[PDB]
Amino acid sequence: DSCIQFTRHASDVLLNLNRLRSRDILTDVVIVVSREQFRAHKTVLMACSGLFYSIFTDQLKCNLSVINLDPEINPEGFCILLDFMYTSRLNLREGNIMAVMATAMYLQMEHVVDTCRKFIKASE
Amino acid sequence: DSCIQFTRHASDVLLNLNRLRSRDILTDVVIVVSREQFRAHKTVLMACSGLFYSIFTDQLKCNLSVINLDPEINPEGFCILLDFMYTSRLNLREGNIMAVMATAMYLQMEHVVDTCRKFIKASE
């Protein structure tokens, strides 16, 4: 086509989606990770995770307001990944890399799994 | 912080949100523009438009499944802007620039209004 493109549009959209998350506006699901609860937008979760994409395209699960994750999932790893989904920034540290990679594999977040594997290979 | 960032994350999220729109997945509102209907995600509309942000943060309007736009709004101008919201690409042409600018002013999409004003100033 003969379209023009606004370079910062996608980044500005995600920034606004994160502002809605911070003010708890139009969040439509709670993700339960052991004793912790995380409110989010189903669409953003689906856009970032192969697992949430499969869950919310299921004719029964699409209507659930609460999703319980596997008990092996670490709440801090999930929190770090939820922040990444809404900001593109990953808080990857020596102390959390194993939990983050395990959570990203479960959530099916291929690019996160890739950088975790590379950061681990560098430290061996 | 000491975060790393995935450059393409925001673009990939928006691409996935557009795929959900194309398959009509988790769309939660219909925007009526005269005889035409456009299905969309309330969160994406709010993230792109000052008008939709104000509408869906209203305690009564946040719960509406149908929003009727002013009858002066052109359905083609709206369609072009809805595509822009979900893709960052604006199909701006000599034949549609006036309708697109009028619609962007109504929707409160400042960057679109700015490029329309510049393209119009160049042709005078």
């Binding site: 379209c3 023009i4 493109q5 606004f6 370079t7 | 690409r89 604006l90 960057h111 490029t115």
Partner: peptide, 4 residues
């Protein structure tokens, strides 16, 4: 704005 750019030509994509």
């Amino acid at each position: 704005w750019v030509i994509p």
